[PDB]
Assembly symmetry: D5
Homo-oligomer: 176 residues x 10
């Protein structure tokens, strides 16, 4: 139990840790699980907080390119330690007044801080997580781990490339 | 160190647990300590969440009756496990749309869950706290502990009479 | 076994600790148990001592207004660390001489200090308990915990309000 | 850490356990200590409860014959787990009504149960003590231990005989 | 194993510790158990040593008054840490030459020190026991514990009255 | 020491683990340390093995774009569990015969497996590491962690973008 | 503490365990120590009991030949677990009645069983020791250990031979 | 786990530790076990590294004289902590440029460092092994352990002589 | 495991420790056990070393008087920490040249030091045993233990006397 | 303390374990230490037993070729678990009768079995050691370990070659 060492259950080429929670999807609360994405690829990413003073360009970019992700049989889910009521309020607030507006990416609530601890992204002194990202294949196996310091974000193009690459490895062998 | 027994540091006739955090006070972020209230009485209470579908009649009632509490040398502080950004958004939201509206009672953030564990109010399976209330005298001594189940709230009149009674006991002897 | 942290078995939204003992009811010794109140609400409260120099206004007020509590399907029981013989002598002594006088509220003896430790009210250095109050619903679930400092007592009106509120929550949903 | 094995600090020919408390002496509350009896002999005895249905013949007999004990440089103290208020009420109640009446033997209160555990007389299941008696010489050394069942009491003549014998041993050598 | 605390097995109102040994009875060696006295009362007492320069007035007095004890359905047994050969020699020695002389009270040998440790009378530094006495009812329940410092002995009259009182309590209720 | 959990010393926003070793630089053995890059940015990455049947496009791409990394004050270092003699032979082998050819990127040796364990990349079952990449700032603070499953490699463009982003955050504040 | 293995402090060519006690010498009680024999040889032997039905031929033989032991600068001491009062009575009884009669060998009392445990001769189930013998030189060094079953005793001639042999070894070298 | 003491599983006249791995045999990768050599003698030896600047005299000498070992029903296997790809490249490189060239002795890979630890040859600070040699009989029993320091190597003639001696001992008794 | 206290398994009136080994009997190696002497008496003794510069008068004396020991149904065995080859060479060497010469007493070997440790005679600092002797009855029960300091040996006459005494005790009762 | 693993203190390129003892040198008893060979090379070897039926070919061969070893600044010492008296008798016995005869190689005694345990050669079940050999350089650093099974011995030519090789490595660098 040395700080954040033993807490993390995330290992590559191993079954990704199981999570369940309440997500705001299409403006309604829903129950979501990891195994709901079996037989399909999943991009699962963590961002620090809602209602901050910085534009959520990552979520907006991922949502605007969502049909490009499911054109290769992949879903995308975002997570935060906020509650589903805060997520709904963040969506329901107009983007001009510092909000999300309509979004097509499910917003998962980690109010118990447990999903964050399983994936090793929770910051004890901060009370929230860092900016992180995970790729999970059809069989629920962790294939990629990316972890950034807080200011910096993640690129949609890189995630597309990585998912296509992992799928190509799944289908064929090795490329020269 | 199981459940809420060993975690709770709150005891009556003992120095109340020390807390510090960031609060939305009069619309701006501020840094607040417990010792900022030394020499005065303090009503420190918890509520489950922001942006819920239930009217926050407790906070509104306490804030509307603030001159009665200040006239007897007492301040009032509310706490929740939400971030200061969520508190600010909840205040800035119109009350007709479900928001708090303007308030004169500081909203303290307990994003790290530590304040909740100190006072024995955090619910592990829920991710938030129950509805609890504490009275702290001029010297920072816990005088009263009140814990309700989640649905039911607290009455401003009872808090007024309790604080007046504690002050009267401080000034003089027992009454016949 | 850190002082009084681990001794208390009282948790909210959990089954209230089981207690049994000998009570002075209607001037006679009787055997009383917690489960004797199943199917009804129960106001279970503690007070420091018998035969003291202060007036027992709490017990007298609760007993004098017992039909209001019984009209909402609720019983009331008082507890102390005194023996049943002391309770009987306190009742049998005229109230003008400093006694209790006739009472309609059962007086429960906690001579072994076990009930006090279960509910986390026993004061080790004093040899008696503080002023505590507990509400238990039809199913034996703790709904409310109130702990005052020794000088200050409890209000019958607040207890009535809280019992009515919990019952209303039991019957209907949430009120706006 | 058995029920009454490790708790008892009472050993013969060893210094008697130190005790302090509040006693009803001549109708007034007083502070009493073991070392207040240094340089004199002390008969320290326990009895189960106040305000019981049985006659306190032991206390009455010891008090009525107090000049015999004082004529051989010896005091007598009685102890119980009742509070000093119960002792005062028991004395103030007329003996015809079942009370103690006026008494010349101090009544020591053990509400914290500590004195009872030091002398190994506290009964855990009952919440009070058995009938025990201890003799302590001028130097605070335990000379005699006597433990009876709850029904059976002690004799004043035997106590006087034992005190005279111990004093004679203190002065001279051995008698043939 | 703190000194002589955990060693003692003797408790009031609990089954008395079981003992067995070799006794000099009527001038012959015999095997004796505790259960040989079931259905009768038993006075079991200890004395320091044989062949000392002090007259054994206790043993002589108890033996001379044996018909008084037998007339109330009671036996008496004496014990010491000496061997049965020493007891036999002490009896066979003329009383004028410092011996015991003929006796009607069995002398039990505790050469292994185990009986002494069971009843909490053995003195580690002395190598023998103190002067102790125990009363055991028909069912083998310890009713009275008396422990004297080494110089002082016991009175036969007190033992008679104690046994009569315990028997009276067995037969009927409390006396007024 | 639960598998690879406690072994890893690599944490974000914390000083990157210290490493030292022998590197093949410009065709010669040299001693290299982490502190040799203090006051400059460093891209530290791992690759599985030398002399394999798969072309090392990652190393070749990083080396060919070295002047573009150096224009933003950044070095690049590669690590493997192979010995410096294996690295030298791999470089000293023509690329047409399945070799590295000349390279401008230092090749570090992790023959003791310590560097891999510190950065949490070593695979116990296979005896080498996965494909990992780390960004370290001027002050030796870990800024970003990337872990790919073995088949899939890393992109020079993404690393350049991330380093530019971290540097921009270092210089200015936050961008809208 | 495995039975009797760890209790014994007796080792050969090592300083013999220290003992002190009360001995009957010339018919008077005396305090005796091991170091009282320094600079002088000592034969220290253990026998089971006093006042038994078997003639003490060992003690009588050793005493009758005491001048043949002190003529080679050697003392003899006997020990038993009996008390000095029993030893005195055993001496003060004529041999025709089963006694020692006058004796010139000191009789040491081991009432605390500690000397026996140090020399590893105490029998737990018996309550006394076996028949044993030890030789100690001028410097307090154990030179010989002899241990017999209870029924069999020791020979004075063998002890004389052994003491002469050890003294001759002290004076000169090995003999051919 | 005292450094390198408990790791070693090799013991004379005991079943040799079991090993399995990948070897370069006749220019192809193969799977090899220890039990593949049952019914034959086996010379299992370690050497530090591949591609070093020193000449591999041991391997070349053993391979060039392999028919002598095979004529006495003996196999030879070499091991190192390098990967099978490094072994294949070392063989494929011409001997003029510092390679093995063609070899008839299998090259076993110990990339996991486990075989080295089982046979007690791994050097923790170096990252490789020392030069050690082991003889294993038909039944898989270790007959000899030889451990040279790093510079010094092993002789083919001595190994042949030792294998012949062990076989002769197997066939018949001791020779005069 | 305190030095040599815990090692010894030899206790009186208890079954003697089991031993097995290789003995030189009548000039030939034989396998010998303790149970080979069941149903008859055994004298088992130790001596320091073979081939020393001191004449082995003990062994010679025991062997020369062997028919006198056999006439009372008793065997004699000697033990040492030397190997059977050393024993055979010692016997096979002429007595004039510092040897044993022919002997009729079996010479047992304790090369593993186990027999010596079981009987508590082994000396850790010197690597051999002291001079000890043991008597074992028909039932394999240790009857007498003799331990001499190294210079001094044992007497055949005393052993004969002791064996005759033990046998007489076995047959009859006690002698006067 | 797992069998023979923790006992061994011998490791390559480390200071060889320190030993001291008694040796038979030129027919005389001498005291020998390991540090007596500082500044010279040392061949320290073990052999099973003395006086065995097998010819001591190893010792005789090493002794007859001692001038070759001394011409390269090297000493030779043999060790066994036998006593120095056995070594002296083995030398003094004529070689025709199964002895060493005159020898120029010191014979060291390991009667305490400690030297054997330090070098990991002692065999617990047999009570002696196997055939092992050790090379120790000028600075007392263990430089080779060789462990043959008991039937098979060591060759003088190989030891000479190894010592020459180690000395040549000491003088200059590696040879091609």
């Amino acid at each position: 139990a040395d700080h954040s060492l033993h807490l993390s259950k995330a290992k590559i080429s191993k079954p990704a840790p199981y999570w369940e929670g309440t997500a705001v999807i299409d403006g309604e609360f829903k129950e979501l699980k990891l195994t709901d994405y079996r037989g399909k690829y999943l991009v699962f990413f963590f961002y620090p907080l809602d209602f901050t003073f910085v534009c959520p360009t990552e979520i907006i970019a991922f949502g605007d390119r969502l049909e490009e992700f499911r054109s290769i049989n992949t879903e995308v889910v975002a997570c935060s330690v906020d509650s589903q009521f805060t997520h709904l309020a963040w969506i329901n607030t107009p983007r001009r007044q510092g909000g999300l507006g309509p979004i097509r990416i499910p917003l998962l609530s980690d109010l118990t801080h447990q999903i964050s601890k399983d994936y090793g992204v929770y910051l004890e002194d901060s009370g929230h997580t860092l900016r992180g990202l995970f790729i999970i294949d059809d069989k629920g196996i962790l294939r990629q781990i990316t972890l950034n310091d807080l200011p910096v974000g993640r690129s949609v193009d890189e995630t597309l490339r990585l998912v296509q690459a992992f799928q190509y490895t799944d289908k064929h062998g090795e490329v020269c």
